[PDB]
Design a protein around this ligand. Structure first.
Ligand code: COA
Ligand code: COA
Ligand code: SIS
Ligand code: SIS
Lengths: 185, 190
């Protein structure tokens, strides 16, 4: 099982519609906004006989972290969205293949990987070496400043790959994402 | 005719990345480079357009994903998915022969295929080229969404921005006289 990696702009609209239908069904809670969040980066795709059986995406965002010394960091983040395997093909390494391709993008292009894991996905990320975030989560809003996202506490994983020299993340500290509509994480 | 290759940052060999950075720095040339380490860093994370000829990188550009914050004339805020154009450059001795056009042709294919809006901050030099390709001059005040103050004006970026509205949400009126705000990053916000 190997995933193809393709930019959103190189994806035909029928394959985009097909990936979106496969992802909605795999979550059936996956909304229009959740799909919009998966656009603009690299998709990992696995098909069988022109049926999409696995998908994931990694999109560029800024993750804001303030160290104990008070210095702010706006990290180039590869954010993992719309990871899904068709129900009948689960427990066969398709998830592993999707994440191998998305982590290739994260390690090659970003300072840090981040995602907000569904309950069923948690064991996957733990086994791949992703760090659980235990500190409080927030979003930088345009009109209210930093606003706590308590519904997202205890859901975050990070993959520090190329942090600025001398920066080590304390996972008990606050972490902030950039503003978007729908679920910020 | 040269056609630019589109390559994600993650697919570039470190030797190719170092070469592209050195080519772009030289293209923008004091001992203080106009094109800085932060400017190169801003070009990372998205799709590069590369033109190579006989072992020389002769042209580069990149488009990276950002959020562009815009409040419409009805009071409603939008966080648009933006293809932001960085590090566009042609080696000096190859300028005026359509390489810059070929780079922007490739980057615009990315923007139109993946984003709601394109945006860039142009050298006063390059304003005619963007106007001719159908980019719109931003006339209103520019700002940056900071994590410690709120939206902070960026007056050094005023009358530098161009946008390419490719796929705005239904009923969004884009008025270029209004404020526009970028997401926060170190170095030049625009
Ligand atoms: C999450 C999901 C994509 C995983 O797909 P999958 O095909 O079941 O996953 P895989 O078989 O590739 O297994 C992924 C890895 O997790 C491991 N794993 C799975 N369940 C595990 C568990 N309970 N404990 C430890 N490891 C576990 C597997 O061993 C595998 O690692 P390995 O290849 O090293 O053995 C799938 O359950 C799904 O689509 N769910 C619905 C949509 C969803 O919630 N997605 C959220 C994405 S964050
Ligand atoms: C700006 C730059 C990328 C243009 O690339 P180029 O290959 O020289 O330009 P092209 O030949 O593709 O011409 C595209 C347009 O640029 C303009 N232009 C800019 N410099 C030009 C030059 N030296 N000769 C001819 N046209 C030039 C022309 O208006 C042209 O439109 P036209 O072909 O319809 O006449 C390039 O000259 C450069 O690297 N300069 C450094 C500044 C910079 O990097 N800006 C990037 C975005 S702000
Ligand atoms: C309360 N604790 C948590 C609970 O809130 C929830 O976390 C959500 C998480 O899945 C969401 O992301 C996944 O789901 C979808 C579809 N919605 C799209 C992308 C997927 N990566 C994220 N966008 C928002 C999180 N809040 O599940 C895990 C949890 C531990 O139970
Ligand atoms: C106030 N006057 C303005 C003046 O500040 C300047 O704008 C700058 C613009 O070039 C910069 O982008 C270019 O340069 C570099 C290297 N630095 C990288 C990518 C290039 N697209 C942008 N990052 C910041 C802008 N402030 O030129 C236009 C102007 C109107 O004259």
């Amino acid at each position: 099982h190997t995933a193809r990696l393709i930019h959103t702009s190189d994806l035909d609209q029928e394959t985009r519609d097909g990936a979106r239908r496969m992802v909605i069904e795999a979550f059936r809670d996956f909304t229009d906004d959740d799909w919009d969040h998966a656009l603009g980066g690299m998709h990992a795709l696995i098909s069988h006989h022109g049926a999409l059986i696995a998908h994931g995406a990694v999109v560029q965002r800024r993750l804001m972290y303030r160290g104990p010394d008070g210095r702010g960091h706006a990290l180039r983040c590869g954010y993992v969205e719309a990871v899904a395997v068709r129900e009948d093909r689960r427990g066969d390494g398709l998830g592993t293949a999707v994440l191998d391709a998305l982590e290739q993008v994260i390690r090659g292009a970003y300072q840090i990987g981040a995602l907000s894991a569904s309950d069923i996905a948690r064991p996957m990320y733990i086994a791949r070496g992703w760090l659980s975030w235990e500190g409080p989560t927030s979003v930088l809003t345009p009109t209210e400043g930093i606003v706590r996202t308590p519904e997202d506490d205890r859901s975050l994983f990070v993959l520090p790959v190329d942090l600025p020299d001398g920066l080590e993340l304390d996972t008990a500290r606050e972490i902030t994402c950039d503003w978007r509509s729908g679920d910020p994480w």
